[PDB]
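Complex record, two chains
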Amino acid sequence: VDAENQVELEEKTRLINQVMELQHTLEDLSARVDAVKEENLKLKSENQVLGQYIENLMSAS
Amino acid sequence: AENQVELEEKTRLINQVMELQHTLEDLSARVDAVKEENLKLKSENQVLGQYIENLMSASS
């Protein structure tokens, strides 16, 4: 009777915490996104420049 | 009737959890793809770098 409403209350509490944690996890992640795509573009630039230099050193032989 | 109202509330709550899980699963898959490629590129640039400093440290 009132023991069923306390099961349901405890169940909703657990789901509510889950929404909170999910939304936090999701925020941390969305804020890390641009620093990851930025690094990716750097590394692609370095890679291209390095490969191109190796092409020139090797052709000089 | 009143039990139907409490179940709708719980369903909007469950739905919120599911949608947040979906959004997070997608995003973290995307970011992990990019992070995996970054690791591959750091590994590759180190190989190229080391090779340059060898060809140059041979003609010096």
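Note: The domain at 1-60 of chain B is CATH 1.20.5.170 (Single alpha-helices involved in coiled-coils or other helix-helix interfaces).
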